[PDB]
């Protein structure tokens, strides 16, 4: 995905920036498929954003569901970790 017009992603990024302020947020990616919407936060520490056995992600699903009006089973919430472009796998 890439920056530009898209509406939802800007509201959701504004939302999550507050939610995950100290947690280590950066941004989010989104997909919308013939099957569901997908929401993929980008943060320094994915475990904090998940919380204790997925606590925070489950709650953040419900609040997003309420705020944005998502149908259940048709929003999915994921967490990606931040990592630079560049470097190798191992090169040996």
Swiss-Prot record:
Domain named KH type-2: residues: 12-83
Post-translational modification: Methylation by PRMT1 is required for import into the nucleolus and for ribosome assembly.
Effect ascribed to mutating residue 61 to D/E/R: Abolishes phosphorylation by PKB
Source organism, top-level taxon: Eukaryota
Intracellular or extracellular location(s): Cytoplasm; Nucleus; Nucleus, Nucleolus; Mitochondrion inner membrane
Cross-link annotation Glycyl lysine isopeptide (Lys-Gly) (interchain with G-Cter in ubiquitin), location: 81
Residues where Asymmetric dimethylarginine is found: 55-56, 58
UniProt name for this protein: Small ribosomal subunit protein uS3
Species the sequence originates in: Homo sapiens (Human)
Residues of the full protein shown: 17 to 95 of 243
């Amino acid at each position: 995905g890439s920056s530009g017009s898209s509406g939802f992603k800007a509201e959701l990024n504004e939302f999550l920036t507050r939610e995950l302020a100290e947690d280590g947020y950066s941004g989010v990616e989104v997909r919308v498929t013939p099957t569901r919407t997908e929401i993929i936060i980008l943060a320094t520490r994915t475990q904090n954003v998940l919380g204790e056995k997925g606590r925070r992600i489950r709650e953040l699903t419900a609040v997003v569901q309420k705020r944005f009006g998502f149908p259940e089973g048709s929003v999915e919430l994921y967490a990606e970790k931040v990592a630079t472009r560049g470097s190798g796998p191992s090169s040996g």
